[PDB]
């Protein structure tokens, strides 16, 4: 069992209002055939158009919700909706486009999926809540064949052109008209009771139904994300590198060491309550502080209630010392805290839209994070940038232009002139900091934190 078998049963009950008379006994093999696609007995990397829930999870970056509503069935016009917010109307002859024929519609579909997916995936997985018209309309914009490579590169073929009889990946498809070898999954096969909106609305108040096809496409992908990443968490699935994953993570470790090392020198707390990830290490191992760890896994549903994390009888007195919440999302942080909270609103290739305002951050692993809430930080202030260093002023070993900056907290800057070594480190750390901030991370600290207190650690 590597893939989904074509001889697997397909529950057709969700299809008999668009397709009345549909046989109850149905397989994926018969379904694909009914849809207008001939598989020719090809053993060439595309065993089935439909995929498993496990394969859908491994390729979540490729998910695009898809819904088709009959505006009036090859006689009446159709409204095609995608989780990108696009609405295309096809005539057989939230971006609501007017009625145009299929030969122009398929060109817009290729453009759209390619621009959306080229920096996320090698494929498209159409997430469906199948009623009938979406499966029957695929023959109008989808070509299937053996697995292929791009005509201009080595990435797998995701598009095909009838004008030039060639195949292309998502990056080299300009002008292409057919969606080559797509993937799909039907959420109704996962055994839900009730209609799409009832099931979606049980866990999400952000996506509202309007009746347009794109609203259903959005609710479908959202519901599929909740099922596979909110109420089900598989932290063993690793995801490929598609951006600055290595630098974002490397930057977060440098910023964590820096921010925590300085908080301990500035306010000399006797104890540090490290709340979060059960696999954590002391980010500042040479600190005098008493480091006490408390296990808490990345919540995907709702943010942790600080009342359930602490209270119920551990230092018990968390108000003693400082609390470190590094990516441990709570409802309202205590005033004596240092916090790194990922901002779910951030626009990036690593951040995919999620469920109930949350987002699915995929970087080595998929972490669905609850919606960013500015009110969680009422007892804290934003952490200002600063570079602190106690290291000796010695160059060892890249050209130089004098560094002038107040936020470079070093012995040389105290003594009136930054050395080359610390100026290199300041700019390197400033880029690691800028990297993490733009990736969506936000830093918060107790109101009494003052960098002026770091200068007296040089005597
Ligand atoms: C082989 S198939 O995908 O099942 C049917 C088909 N054959 C095509 C040739 C050109 C364009 C679209 C086409 N759809
Ligand atoms: Zn290519
Ligand atoms: Zn939703
Ligand atoms: Zn120096």
mmCIF file with all atom_site columns, N, CA, C and O in Angstrom, residues 176-200:
data_model
loop_
_atom_site.group_PDB
_atom_site.id
_atom_site.type_symbol
_atom_site.label_atom_id
_atom_site.label_alt_id
_atom_site.label_comp_id
_atom_site.label_asym_id
_atom_site.label_entity_id
_atom_site.label_seq_id
_atom_site.pdbx_PDB_ins_code
_atom_site.Cartn_x
_atom_site.Cartn_y
_atom_site.Cartn_z
_atom_site.occupancy
_atom_site.B_iso_or_equiv
_atom_site.pdbx_formal_charge
_atom_site.auth_seq_id
_atom_site.auth_comp_id
_atom_site.auth_asym_id
_atom_site.auth_atom_id
_atom_site.pdbx_PDB_model_num
ATOM 1   N N  . UNK A 1 176 ? 0.239   28.093 -21.101 1.00 0.00 ? 176 UNK A N  1
ATOM 2   C CA . UNK A 1 176 ? -0.191  26.686 -21.217 1.00 0.00 ? 176 UNK A CA 1
ATOM 3   C C  . UNK A 1 176 ? -1.699  26.560 -20.945 1.00 0.00 ? 176 UNK A C  1
ATOM 4   O O  . UNK A 1 176 ? -2.262  27.423 -20.270 1.00 0.00 ? 176 UNK A O  1
ATOM 5   N N  . UNK A 1 177 ? -2.378  25.566 -21.545 1.00 0.00 ? 177 UNK A N  1
ATOM 6   C CA . UNK A 1 177 ? -3.833  25.477 -21.418 1.00 0.00 ? 177 UNK A CA 1
ATOM 7   C C  . UNK A 1 177 ? -4.348  24.285 -20.633 1.00 0.00 ? 177 UNK A C  1
ATOM 8   O O  . UNK A 1 177 ? -5.487  24.351 -20.208 1.00 0.00 ? 177 UNK A O  1
ATOM 9   N N  . UNK A 1 178 ? -3.552  23.223 -20.408 1.00 0.00 ? 178 UNK A N  1
ATOM 10  C CA . UNK A 1 178 ? -4.062  22.050 -19.676 1.00 0.00 ? 178 UNK A CA 1
ATOM 11  C C  . UNK A 1 178 ? -3.354  21.740 -18.395 1.00 0.00 ? 178 UNK A C  1
ATOM 12  O O  . UNK A 1 178 ? -2.132  21.862 -18.319 1.00 0.00 ? 178 UNK A O  1
ATOM 13  N N  . UNK A 1 179 ? -4.126  21.322 -17.385 1.00 0.00 ? 179 UNK A N  1
ATOM 14  C CA . UNK A 1 179 ? -3.585  20.934 -16.099 1.00 0.00 ? 179 UNK A CA 1
ATOM 15  C C  . UNK A 1 179 ? -3.177  19.485 -16.259 1.00 0.00 ? 179 UNK A C  1
ATOM 16  O O  . UNK A 1 179 ? -4.034  18.589 -16.355 1.00 0.00 ? 179 UNK A O  1
ATOM 17  N N  . UNK A 1 180 ? -1.874  19.253 -16.363 1.00 0.00 ? 180 UNK A N  1
ATOM 18  C CA . UNK A 1 180 ? -1.369  17.907 -16.563 1.00 0.00 ? 180 UNK A CA 1
ATOM 19  C C  . UNK A 1 180 ? -1.118  17.123 -15.283 1.00 0.00 ? 180 UNK A C  1
ATOM 20  O O  . UNK A 1 180 ? -0.383  17.591 -14.400 1.00 0.00 ? 180 UNK A O  1
ATOM 21  N N  . UNK A 1 181 ? -1.713  15.910 -15.211 1.00 0.00 ? 181 UNK A N  1
ATOM 22  C CA . UNK A 1 181 ? -1.614  14.955 -14.103 1.00 0.00 ? 181 UNK A CA 1
ATOM 23  C C  . UNK A 1 181 ? -1.888  15.559 -12.728 1.00 0.00 ? 181 UNK A C  1
ATOM 24  O O  . UNK A 1 181 ? -1.018  15.545 -11.846 1.00 0.00 ? 181 UNK A O  1
ATOM 25  N N  . UNK A 1 182 ? -3.114  16.068 -12.510 1.00 0.00 ? 182 UNK A N  1
ATOM 26  C CA . UNK A 1 182 ? -3.426  16.623 -11.196 1.00 0.00 ? 182 UNK A CA 1
ATOM 27  C C  . UNK A 1 182 ? -3.697  15.518 -10.201 1.00 0.00 ? 182 UNK A C  1
ATOM 28  O O  . UNK A 1 182 ? -3.849  14.350 -10.556 1.00 0.00 ? 182 UNK A O  1
ATOM 29  N N  . UNK A 1 183 ? -3.785  15.897 -8.938  1.00 0.00 ? 183 UNK A N  1
ATOM 30  C CA . UNK A 1 183 ? -4.165  14.974 -7.872  1.00 0.00 ? 183 UNK A CA 1
ATOM 31  C C  . UNK A 1 183 ? -5.414  15.526 -7.227  1.00 0.00 ? 183 UNK A C  1
ATOM 32  O O  . UNK A 1 183 ? -5.710  16.722 -7.363  1.00 0.00 ? 183 UNK A O  1
ATOM 33  N N  . UNK A 1 184 ? -6.176  14.668 -6.565  1.00 0.00 ? 184 UNK A N  1
ATOM 34  C CA . UNK A 1 184 ? -7.389  15.111 -5.876  1.00 0.00 ? 184 UNK A CA 1
ATOM 35  C C  . UNK A 1 184 ? -7.723  14.225 -4.702  1.00 0.00 ? 184 UNK A C  1
ATOM 36  O O  . UNK A 1 184 ? -7.241  13.089 -4.611  1.00 0.00 ? 184 UNK A O  1
ATOM 37  N N  . UNK A 1 185 ? -8.544  14.755 -3.789  1.00 0.00 ? 185 UNK A N  1
ATOM 38  C CA . UNK A 1 185 ? -9.026  13.997 -2.641  1.00 0.00 ? 185 UNK A CA 1
ATOM 39  C C  . UNK A 1 185 ? -10.458 14.439 -2.296  1.00 0.00 ? 185 UNK A C  1
ATOM 40  O O  . UNK A 1 185 ? -10.777 15.630 -2.400  1.00 0.00 ? 185 UNK A O  1
ATOM 41  N N  . UNK A 1 186 ? -11.332 13.483 -1.980  1.00 0.00 ? 186 UNK A N  1
ATOM 42  C CA . UNK A 1 186 ? -12.711 13.809 -1.644  1.00 0.00 ? 186 UNK A CA 1
ATOM 43  C C  . UNK A 1 186 ? -12.898 13.624 -0.164  1.00 0.00 ? 186 UNK A C  1
ATOM 44  O O  . UNK A 1 186 ? -12.799 12.499 0.349   1.00 0.00 ? 186 UNK A O  1
ATOM 45  N N  . UNK A 1 187 ? -13.143 14.756 0.519   1.00 0.00 ? 187 UNK A N  1
ATOM 46  C CA . UNK A 1 187 ? -13.329 14.877 1.956   1.00 0.00 ? 187 UNK A CA 1
ATOM 47  C C  . UNK A 1 187 ? -14.552 14.110 2.431   1.00 0.00 ? 187 UNK A C  1
ATOM 48  O O  . UNK A 1 187 ? -14.542 13.580 3.536   1.00 0.00 ? 187 UNK A O  1
ATOM 49  N N  . UNK A 1 188 ? -15.583 13.996 1.591   1.00 0.00 ? 188 UNK A N  1
ATOM 50  C CA . UNK A 1 188 ? -16.768 13.235 1.927   1.00 0.00 ? 188 UNK A CA 1
ATOM 51  C C  . UNK A 1 188 ? -16.483 11.747 2.124   1.00 0.00 ? 188 UNK A C  1
ATOM 52  O O  . UNK A 1 188 ? -17.301 11.044 2.719   1.00 0.00 ? 188 UNK A O  1
ATOM 53  N N  . UNK A 1 189 ? -15.357 11.244 1.599   1.00 0.00 ? 189 UNK A N  1
ATOM 54  C CA . UNK A 1 189 ? -14.980 9.847  1.801   1.00 0.00 ? 189 UNK A CA 1
ATOM 55  C C  . UNK A 1 189 ? -14.483 9.598  3.240   1.00 0.00 ? 189 UNK A C  1
ATOM 56  O O  . UNK A 1 189 ? -14.384 8.455  3.652   1.00 0.00 ? 189 UNK A O  1
ATOM 57  N N  . UNK A 1 190 ? -14.175 10.650 3.995   1.00 0.00 ? 190 UNK A N  1
ATOM 58  C CA . UNK A 1 190 ? -13.713 10.526 5.363   1.00 0.00 ? 190 UNK A CA 1
ATOM 59  C C  . UNK A 1 190 ? -14.851 10.342 6.377   1.00 0.00 ? 190 UNK A C  1
ATOM 60  O O  . UNK A 1 190 ? -14.612 10.344 7.589   1.00 0.00 ? 190 UNK A O  1
ATOM 61  N N  . UNK A 1 191 ? -16.065 10.133 5.878   1.00 0.00 ? 191 UNK A N  1
ATOM 62  C CA . UNK A 1 191 ? -17.218 9.826  6.697   1.00 0.00 ? 191 UNK A CA 1
ATOM 63  C C  . UNK A 1 191 ? -17.707 10.929 7.590   1.00 0.00 ? 191 UNK A C  1
ATOM 64  O O  . UNK A 1 191 ? -17.677 10.793 8.811   1.00 0.00 ? 191 UNK A O  1
ATOM 65  N N  . UNK A 1 192 ? -18.201 12.008 6.986   1.00 0.00 ? 192 UNK A N  1
ATOM 66  C CA . UNK A 1 192 ? -18.803 13.095 7.753   1.00 0.00 ? 192 UNK A CA 1
ATOM 67  C C  . UNK A 1 192 ? -20.350 12.942 7.749   1.00 0.00 ? 192 UNK A C  1
ATOM 68  O O  . UNK A 1 192 ? -20.935 12.431 6.789   1.00 0.00 ? 192 UNK A O  1
ATOM 69  N N  . UNK A 1 193 ? -20.996 13.391 8.822   1.00 0.00 ? 193 UNK A N  1
ATOM 70  C CA . UNK A 1 193 ? -22.457 13.412 8.898   1.00 0.00 ? 193 UNK A CA 1
ATOM 71  C C  . UNK A 1 193 ? -22.844 14.868 8.697   1.00 0.00 ? 193 UNK A C  1
ATOM 72  O O  . UNK A 1 193 ? -22.226 15.775 9.281   1.00 0.00 ? 193 UNK A O  1
ATOM 73  N N  . UNK A 1 194 ? -23.826 15.096 7.839   1.00 0.00 ? 194 UNK A N  1
ATOM 74  C CA . UNK A 1 194 ? -24.262 16.453 7.536   1.00 0.00 ? 194 UNK A CA 1
ATOM 75  C C  . UNK A 1 194 ? -23.554 17.074 6.347   1.00 0.00 ? 194 UNK A C  1
ATOM 76  O O  . UNK A 1 194 ? -22.654 16.464 5.769   1.00 0.00 ? 194 UNK A O  1
ATOM 77  N N  . UNK A 1 195 ? -23.951 18.309 5.989   1.00 0.00 ? 195 UNK A N  1
ATOM 78  C CA . UNK A 1 195 ? -23.413 19.006 4.824   1.00 0.00 ? 195 UNK A CA 1
ATOM 79  C C  . UNK A 1 195 ? -22.100 19.751 5.113   1.00 0.00 ? 195 UNK A C  1
ATOM 80  O O  . UNK A 1 195 ? -21.701 19.830 6.264   1.00 0.00 ? 195 UNK A O  1
ATOM 81  N N  . UNK A 1 196 ? -21.402 20.235 4.069   1.00 0.00 ? 196 UNK A N  1
ATOM 82  C CA . UNK A 1 196 ? -20.120 20.935 4.207   1.00 0.00 ? 196 UNK A CA 1
ATOM 83  C C  . UNK A 1 196 ? -20.138 22.062 5.235   1.00 0.00 ? 196 UNK A C  1
ATOM 84  O O  . UNK A 1 196 ? -19.297 22.065 6.132   1.00 0.00 ? 196 UNK A O  1
ATOM 85  N N  . UNK A 1 197 ? -21.064 23.031 5.100   1.00 0.00 ? 197 UNK A N  1
ATOM 86  C CA . UNK A 1 197 ? -21.112 24.148 6.024   1.00 0.00 ? 197 UNK A CA 1
ATOM 87  C C  . UNK A 1 197 ? -21.297 23.685 7.479   1.00 0.00 ? 197 UNK A C  1
ATOM 88  O O  . UNK A 1 197 ? -20.528 24.118 8.323   1.00 0.00 ? 197 UNK A O  1
ATOM 89  N N  . UNK A 1 198 ? -22.213 22.730 7.760   1.00 0.00 ? 198 UNK A N  1
ATOM 90  C CA . UNK A 1 198 ? -22.382 22.248 9.138   1.00 0.00 ? 198 UNK A CA 1
ATOM 91  C C  . UNK A 1 198 ? -21.061 21.726 9.750   1.00 0.00 ? 198 UNK A C  1
ATOM 92  O O  . UNK A 1 198 ? -20.675 22.168 10.827  1.00 0.00 ? 198 UNK A O  1
ATOM 93  N N  . UNK A 1 199 ? -20.343 20.866 9.026   1.00 0.00 ? 199 UNK A N  1
ATOM 94  C CA . UNK A 1 199 ? -19.071 20.337 9.503   1.00 0.00 ? 199 UNK A CA 1
ATOM 95  C C  . UNK A 1 199 ? -17.983 21.419 9.617   1.00 0.00 ? 199 UNK A C  1
ATOM 96  O O  . UNK A 1 199 ? -17.252 21.427 10.610  1.00 0.00 ? 199 UNK A O  1
ATOM 97  N N  . UNK A 1 200 ? -17.879 22.328 8.621   1.00 0.00 ? 200 UNK A N  1
ATOM 98  C CA . UNK A 1 200 ? -16.878 23.410 8.635   1.00 0.00 ? 200 UNK A CA 1
ATOM 99  C C  . UNK A 1 200 ? -17.115 24.349 9.810   1.00 0.00 ? 200 UNK A C  1
ATOM 100 O O  . UNK A 1 200 ? -16.182 24.651 10.545  1.00 0.00 ? 200 UNK A O  1
#
